[PDB]
């Protein structure tokens, strides 16, 4: 058992890039089912699913992210284990091929806790550069998915190269906390297991701690009218995005208990999606776009549905 | 009129650097009050409680911050604004010697407007080095919580972080929702409130703690609010359940409007001890406090929470 969902490209409709999203989402799925299906964990499926989405020339994370104001590169990157409950993000970091990796990395380093201080969750810039090269990770010369497993634990990343032409040092959503992603299984408030995964305008989604905010939102009985009003009053006409004139962004969604209720909504343009099922063979990808006439920034687009596991 | 409430070292209790922590305190909120008197914004008002904290060599913060695994200053430094709602902050930044101070120049350049795009609200390393000198910065945990007579609230922190850290490491200093908050009363939250952390950087991280408390603020009752809050969403959180004592302290002011403005302000902390200090505009005269854990209470496991109440205007 198993399902993954996956995104990219999210933003303004690309009449050409739209193909190329789709063959990325589709093998990034693939990806994430292999390794669900070697009975890999939660965490190393969704690494896996990031590092196929980094990889393609066409997205902005990890290989082909956009230059910053000094034409170089700085990654943003985060993955959440709803199990453990613990994370791992890097942020402003270059160098390296895959930055989900080191956020990966981290991750696991951080479950291993005190074995003899608490364990860094978060570097950034050259720190976190040394911290890779210095655990093997290959040195070289927005995206993101939710996973859950047959046994119902969760997990999440998101992985992006930021504003082009953006300040050196600039952080966005992708590396923050409760803001790029979010995995937390069933629980005592928890009745839900929930992943998060977005993406879009930075700043917009890390003011509205957007990841966090939509897993307790999927609390609730109906996770479509869940995310909707989280994605309209949390968002769009959260009083933390008043000033902005349009607020742009997009989010996966995954909700367990095996029963899978999986969604996608946005605010920019289109966005990419792909999603498969251990037991359905093949991923299917699917350009989501505003309705006709409806304004980017200003309304709201859904889509979703449910799959069962075993 | 005005008021602020402001703290300078939230762990382990020292009767040797107590009367230091104490000293700096009153200073910081004096220079709050002064800034508040001069007509500055609360966010100004913040920040210079906040360079004062800093300066002084006892605090990790700024000047005196804990050298990292490689013997160098790296610090974290964030503000906020209840009025704009807008936010700044600094991640391993070093070679300033105010963190705080590039922190709210990034807050308020965000005020101004789009650049083109949104201007950056954190930056990080050398970026946030070079972005600092290109705006006129001077090159070389505390907090602070401050409401205006109008009812405006800022919140502030700043740290060197944990002792021999890997460089990069950034911590709850300079993560939004984590080191601070501030936010002014609005349709959903009847109460202007604002909020500064300190303590061990994941724990506060992980459980989001500035904007948790923010949230629970907003409940009838503040200190039973903030207690349970401490308890159950930060010593008990399932997100920490794999720690063996979870610690950390936060400073909190909320306020009504009555004219008069009701600010009820308190601190509360796991770790041994921490400094506070507070002072009102009309009061003229601020106040220090050393608070400690009750004997036989175990830091990491036991929760200290005091505070008052003060009339504005
Ligand atoms: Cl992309
Ligand atoms: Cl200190």
Redo the contacts between chains.
Sequence with gaps: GGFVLVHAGAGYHSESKAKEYKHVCKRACQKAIEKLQAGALATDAVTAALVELEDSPFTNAGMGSNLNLLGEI?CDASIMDGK??N?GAV??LSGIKNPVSVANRLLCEGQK?KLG??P?????????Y??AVDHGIPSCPTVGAVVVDHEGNVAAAVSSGG?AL??????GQAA????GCWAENT??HNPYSTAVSTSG?G??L??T?LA?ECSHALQAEDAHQALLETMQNKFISS??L???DGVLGGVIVLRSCLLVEFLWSHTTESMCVGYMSAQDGKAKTHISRLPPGAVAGQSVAIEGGVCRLE
């Excluded at 860094?120 to 976190?128: D, Q």
């Design positions: 700085e453990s409950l994370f942020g402003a806790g201080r608490i860094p969750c978060f570097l950034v810039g050259e720190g976190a040394r911290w504003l953006k300040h050196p040092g600039r952080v923050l906390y409760g803001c629980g005592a305008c700043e917009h890390v003011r701690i966090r009083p933390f008043a000033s902005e």
